[PDB]
């Protein structure tokens, strides 16, 4: 499922991401744009057996378990398959675990390189939420 920017924004606000650990809603929408281009089924194999899954490209070596990654920690205690869903709950819940403090969005290189420092609010202005 590929979301529209406002539809995604609304679902994210609805799941507690607005101002979570001090991060304005714009940051989360901008991260998804650059990580999975709003696609819930985006995947991406890295040289290392690790594979990033879903709308927020969550890693299989540390956060979810795809059962094919050598030395998985599975810190979100979830199978990587669930992160590939139209419903973003599982993805949001794991992202919440990952962002433990006000610098935790650095967990997404795309956000650090393409969103941080820019007008991330632009992604939500004109959206109904």
């Amino acid at each position, epitope marked *: 499922k590929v979301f529209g920017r406002c539809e995604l924004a609304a679902a994210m606000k609805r799941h507690g991401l607005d101002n979570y650990r001090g991060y*304005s809603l714009g*940051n989360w929408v901008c991260a998804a744009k650059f990580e999975s281009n709003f696609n819930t089924q985006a995947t991406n194999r890295n040289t290392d057996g690790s594979t990033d899954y879903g709308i927020l490209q969550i890693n299989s070596r540390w956060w979810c378990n795809d059962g094919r990654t050598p030395g998985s920690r599975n810190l979100c205690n979830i199978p990587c398959s669930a992160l590939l869903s139209s419903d973003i709950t599982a993805s949001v819940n794991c992202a919440k675990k990952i962002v433990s403090d006000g610098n935790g969005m650095n967990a997404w290189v795309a956000w650090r390189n393409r969103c941080k*420092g*820019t*007008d991330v609010q632009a992604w939500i202005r004109g959206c109904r939420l």
Partner: antibody
Amino acid sequence: QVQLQESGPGLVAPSQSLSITCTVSGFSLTGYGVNWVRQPPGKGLEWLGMIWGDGNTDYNSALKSRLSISKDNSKSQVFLKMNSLHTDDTARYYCARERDFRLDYWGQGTTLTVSS
Amino acid sequence: DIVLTQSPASLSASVGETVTITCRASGNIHNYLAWYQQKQGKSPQLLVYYTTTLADGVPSRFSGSGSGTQYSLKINSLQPEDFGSYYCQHFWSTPRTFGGGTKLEIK
């Protein structure tokens, strides 16, 4: 730790242009915006404009045409240039760091007086 | 531009009192509102961002509220170090503007 400091000319005539510098340390100019704000003697705060981490700029509507903001990421400096100086421009000028829609760290400010 | 109407211009109070400062926006700012405190001869300092969030190190006696167009800063049990000026500022698009300020002084 995060620090911002302004430097400016102090006194300027209308026939002169104005440049104030904001040197920062403790963070990268690519990851944060820097806003310019002024406070005339005994008055309230006035927003002048800003420069995003990406280099884009936005200005105060009424002053846009007299203002120019630029930065040098390598020198860790941001500049505010003003022309067509009025006496109403006399004020304390500040640069502040913007982190995700809030000015979290401010410089001490520099005082400017617009003479005859 | 979205203009902010802050009131009152001045307020006299005693230590221990609870006061309220208000900021009304000419248009919906969607909670993108911050409050600063400025002490005599110092730079403004951040207190509250995104309407209700306290900056680090700010005591819980300060609390923010609001939605849409009306916003308030409540100070519970004023302390000697709370006196000075207070400003609200919005961050909805650009240009940004500040409220006119409120001088909080000793009764």
